[PDB]
Design a protein around this ligand. Structure first.
Ligand SMILES: COC(=O)[C@H](O[C@H]1CC[C@@H](n2cc(C)c(=O)[nH]c2=O)C1)P(=O)(O)O
Ligand SMILES: OC[C@H]1O[C@@](CO)(O[C@H]2O[C@H](CO)[C@@H](O)[C@H](O)[C@H]2O)[C@@H](O)[C@@H]1O
Ligand SMILES: [Mg+2]
Ligand SMILES: [Mg+2]
Ligand SMILES: [Mg+2]
Lengths: 412, 551
DNA sequence: TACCCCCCCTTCGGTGCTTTGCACCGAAGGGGGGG
């Protein structure tokens, strides 16, 4: 018995119509079990083919969870409500959250089931549950409450959220709290023992307001950037200098001070690739000044809140993965490298799945946005396996790219 | 009485006003016969000229029967009717059926006509009935039920049927009912006396809601005819497949043949359609006749020898693992078998899609593994364990070095040749003592004339004139030259991003005959190192050979 | 001379980087199949 906030899509835009993809047996059972008890609790209610809209649905297990969690792919719906979570009820982003020594992520999504949803908007939350071997046609539902994973859900609940928090934000003044959809980010400069305690205090502080918490521990101060680096060799071959000159040529689009004239001079003959070429005085100095320019930050790179974030990922082999987050090409807001994630030396798709989650998490902490990914993988390969390794309650936007490594710019 | 389904038109649009087709006198009498009986039952109604719509109507006789089908052309109503969301997400496959002690198959008589249409929407179904002459006008009618020919008839029937069956399924949890349109496959582990009793409770429960189960459609004894299959107590097979015997084949002949062969491929192992399909490409008219190649003839020959001997599939045992075994068939063709007990197939199939201009067998095998995984998750809800004709070390070399992410689920090597292999290996480091060829190419955009050549450190040189070429082709051609004019080990420097992208992915097949010749050379070499440098940076032999071939 | 669903093979046109050529993908029209 609560007032329903009215929600309307973006101007001149129709709801989401996205086909449902095949589900494994263990995922369908989990959905049918989850969707049953959600219906006897009024949270969802069956519908029919008169509703033209549809969204994909599936189930995940968070890291170490052991328990199924329902995940809806509201990416198409969230793009068509974009005015809502930006214009009026948006959440400002705390620039100090990335500076805290420890940050914990909690699933507060179970609280969104408290608030009802505008009746005129429920027609857009429609999802279909498939059946093994198409034994049954599609069992369709729709959401009566705030759905988990909708970008409108945390905005509506914010008024109720900021009230439950206010007693604890006053009892602990300098502890930072941020809300990105179904997750709550809470960080302190306290020691680890003190930090984990205040989370339990925040868990109870949520229990008496009616919420469970089925937490992830981060350390943003630990996070490191990966700069462009030039090799160290005692002797340079023609091929070494050719690779170097090409790399500096590429890097010059980012750092304009890069020079290659004195290093190009060393190649001017027609030499065998393995021939050793002693460096001239001027090449050694052109090299040294180049190494220093790459040490510098890029001039005029800063975050723009109106602009979307893009992330490119490159597979370096031997479990190494490098990434760059940017808004304008060659103006990188962050560059980084992962190694020995789950799946190293056995599974590419699992590692890439882990990298996308890590990069998205970092982007939520640092800018409160999830980037659009450029995935080094074929479409059919990614869409076949990624749901088996997805451990998050959000899903970033992605596209598929095929960029042969002409030059190894980000990893030596 | 079953709850009506609310329907609407596309907002701001009105109903269907289109004039009738001229109907044949043999069809009209059988048509007017069927229409008149409907009014007795409340399925159709007479309407006054107050209703201003009209839609064409016709009839064709039912397949495998004497009666006619009342088909209403609603194409213009369909354009202006609201959009639906179909609940028919696929087709069941018999290989996904568990074994049941007793099985029944029953069809509903007049499926759409037993479901009442939306009250407010009924008016838009307006159509008029012809006569033996053009003098009598014929009564105009509105549908009280789902019409055959509407775009909302299937979805509304399918979802309604589910709400009817839901109570029975919850009262009888151990009954498996495969619901596809109006046909119902019902099976149980119950003893057949008890099974037929529960069958009758369901026929009553459908009769509870006005759904008729005719005896003629009802089948009590194997082999059941279901979804175009024949279901036996422990085996299944397709209903027999008729291959046209035509002596001269048109385009529609091959299309019929190919489609039949694809249908056969689900259970008959090893069907191949590559050479037959090559005849289908780029033909203007369906009526045109095209001869059978000596390749396509041999393929149609061995395809018939597979269909000659009868085959059957088994049923699914959830306790045991799923196995999928793939064999290479050549020219980008692959067949597979899914089974649980050896030599007792559940189903078969084939992957033959040529994805991309240049590829290799490993990529294609991976695509086959992905097609099989998804089909398996559709039918059984799990991923099978794989038996693949590729050495463990081949795959380890491929997926680790390739620059894109790739993977195959749990799999083991099966020694059934022809094996999938990588046909050459580019060095990671330049080769000491191998001649260093700096290649380049160039072409004039208007002349379409170009050059391709190289310079080496040993003084070797060549330039070749080229007709009707492109910039990209001369760059590949320059690399071809360096491969021809070099020893078994060679370092090659290019500034062609395009060429290097193709060769580094280690293709073993190509649409381009030039790439196929480059591949042929690469297999011949012992050590090849490709390196890239940027153009017009005054680098080494690259600058020299750019001067030669630009002139 | 109708409707809905799945599958394969081909064509063709949008799309973006490999650049005004070439490569990729998806919509669509051909067929098989279900009802
Ligand atoms: O099939 C069936 O069972 C028939 O069912 C209804 C459900 C789909 C409908 N249907 C069917 C065909 C074959 C067809 O070409 N067109 C068509 O609209 C009729 P039926 O009751 O006439 O036997
Ligand atoms: O929707 C088109 C097509 O792509 C998929 C997944 O690749 O769509 C999802 O991902 C897109 C890219 O991030 C989103 O833009 C889209 O909203 C989301 O549905 C599949 O659903 C579909 O096959
Ligand atoms: Mg029937
Ligand atoms: Mg039927
Ligand atoms: Mg050139």
């Amino acid at each position: 018995p609560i007032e329903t906030v009215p929600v309307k899509l973006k101007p001149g835009m129709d709801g989401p119509k996205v086909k449902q993809w095949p589900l494994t047996e263990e995922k369908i059972k989990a959905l049918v079990e989850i969707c049953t008890e959600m219906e006897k609790e009024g949270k969802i209610s069956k519908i029919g083919p008169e509703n033209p809209y549809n969204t994909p649905v599936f189930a995940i297990k968070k890291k170490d969870s052991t328990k199924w969690r329902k995940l809806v792919d509201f990416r198409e719906l969230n793009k068509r409500t974009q005015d809502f979570w930006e214009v009026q009820l948006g959440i400002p982003h705390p620039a100090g959250l990335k500076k805290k020594k420890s940050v914990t992520v909690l699933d507060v999504g179970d609280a969104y089931f408290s608030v009802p949803l505008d009746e005129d908007f429920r027609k857009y939350t429609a999802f279909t549950i498939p059946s093994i071997n198409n034994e049954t046609p599609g069992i369709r539902y729709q959401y009566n409450v705030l759905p988990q994973g909708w970008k409108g859900s945390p905005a509506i609940f914010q008024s109720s959220m900021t009230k439950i928090l206010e007693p604890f934000k006053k009892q602990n003044p300098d502890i930072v709290i941020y809300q990105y959809m179904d997750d709550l980010y809470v960080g302190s400069d306290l020691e680890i023992g003190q930090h984990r305690t205040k989370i339990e205090e925040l868990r109870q502080h949520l229990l008496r307001w009616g919420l469970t918490t089925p937490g992830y521990e981060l350390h943003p101060d630990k996070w490191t950037v990966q700069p462009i680096v030039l090799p160290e060799k005692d002797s340079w071959t023609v091929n070494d200098i050719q690779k170097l000159v090409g790399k500096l040529n590429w890097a010059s689009q980012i750092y304009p001070g890069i020079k290659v004239r004195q290093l190009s001079k060393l190649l001017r003959g027609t030499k065998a690739l393995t021939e050793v070429i002693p460096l001239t005085e001027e090449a050694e100095l052109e090299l040294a000044e180049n190494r220093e320019i790459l040490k510098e930050p890029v001039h005029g790179v800063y975050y723009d809140p109106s602009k979307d974030l893009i992330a490119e990922i490159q597979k370096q082999g031997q479990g190494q993965w490098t990434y760059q987050i940017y808004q304008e090409p060659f103006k990188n807001l962050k560059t980084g490298k992962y190694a020995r994630m789950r799946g190293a030396h056995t599974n590419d798709v699992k590692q890439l799945t882990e990298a996308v989650q890590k990069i998205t998490t970092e982007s939520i902490v640092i800018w409160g946005k999830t980037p659009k990914f450029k995935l080094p993988i074929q479409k059919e390969t990614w869409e076949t396996w990624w749901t088996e390794y997805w451990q998050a309650t959000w899903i970033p936007e992605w596209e598929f790219v095929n960029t042969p490594p002409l030059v190894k710019l980000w990893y030596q | 009485p079953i709850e009506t389904v609310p329907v609407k038109l596309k907002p701001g649009m009105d109903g269907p006003k289109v004039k009738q087709w001229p109907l044949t006198e043999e069809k009209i009498k059988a048509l007017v016969e069927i229409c008149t009986e409907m009014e007795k039952e409340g399925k159709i109604s007479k309407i006054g000229p107050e209703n201003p719509y009209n839609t064409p109507v016709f009839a064709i006789k039912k397949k495998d029967s004497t009666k006619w089908r009342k088909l209403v052309d609603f194409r213009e109503l369909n354009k202006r009717t609201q959009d639906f969301w179909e609940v028919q997400l696929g087709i069941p496959h018999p290989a996904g059926l568990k074994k049941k002690k007793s099985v029944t198959v029953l069809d509903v008589g007049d499926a759409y006509f037993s479901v009442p249409l939306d009250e407010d929407f009924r008016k838009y179904t307006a159509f008029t009935i012809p006569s033996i002459n053009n003098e009598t006008p014929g009564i105009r009618y509105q549908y009280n039920v789902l019409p055959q020919g509407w775009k909302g008839s299937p979805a509304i029937f399918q979802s309604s049927m589910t709400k009817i069956l839901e109570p029975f399924k919850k009262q009888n949890p151990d009954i498996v009912i495969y619901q596809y349109m109006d046909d119902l496959y019902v099976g149980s582990d119950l003893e057949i006396g008890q099974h037929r009793t529960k069958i009758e409770e369901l026929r009553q429960h459908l009769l509870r809601w006005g759904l008729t189960t005719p005896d003629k459609k009802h089948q009590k004894e194997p082999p059941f005819l279901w979804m175009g299959y024949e279901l036996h107590p422990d085996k299944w097979t397709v209903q027999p497949i008729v291959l046209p015997e035509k002596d001269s084949w048109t385009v529609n002949d091959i299309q019929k043949l190919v489609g039949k062969l694809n249908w056969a491929s689900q259970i008959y192992p090893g069907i191949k359609v590559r050479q037959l399909s090559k005849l289908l490409r780029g033909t203007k008219a369906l009526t045109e006749v095209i001869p059978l190649t000596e390749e396509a003839e041999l393929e149609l020959a061995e395809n018939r020898e597979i269909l000659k001997e009868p085959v059957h599939g088994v049923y699914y045992d959830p306790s045991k693992d799923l196995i999928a075994e793939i064999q290479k068939q050549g020219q980008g063709q692959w067949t597979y078998q899914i089974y649980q007990e050896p030599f007792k197939n559940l189903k078969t199939g084939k992957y033959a899609r040529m994805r991309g201009a240049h590829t290799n067998d490993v990529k294609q095998l991976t695509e086959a593994v992905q097609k099989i995984t998804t089909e398996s998750i559709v039918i059984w809800g799990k991923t099978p364990k794989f038996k693949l004709p590729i050495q463990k070390e081949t795959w380890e070399t491929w997926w680790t070095e390739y620059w894109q992410a790739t993977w195959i689920p749990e799999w083991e090597f099966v020694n059934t040749p022809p094996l999938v292999k990588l046909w050459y290996q580019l060095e990671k480091e330049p080769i000491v003592g191998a001649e260093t060829f700096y290649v380049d190419g160039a072409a004039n955009r208007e002349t379409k004339l170009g050059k391709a050549g190289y310079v080496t450190n040993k003084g070797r040189q060549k330039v070749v004139p080229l007709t009707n070429t492109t910039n990209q082709k001369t760059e590949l051609q320059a690399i071809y030259l360096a491969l021809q004019d070099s020893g078994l080990e060679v370092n090659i420097v290019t500034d062609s991003q395009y060429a290097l992208g193709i060769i580094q992915a280690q293709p073993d097949k190509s649409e381009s005959e030039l790439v196929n010749q480059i591949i042929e050379q690469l297999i011949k070499k012992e050590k090849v190192y490709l390196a890239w440098v940027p153009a017009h940076k005054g680098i080494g032999g690259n600058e020299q050979v750019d001067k030669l071939v630009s002139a």
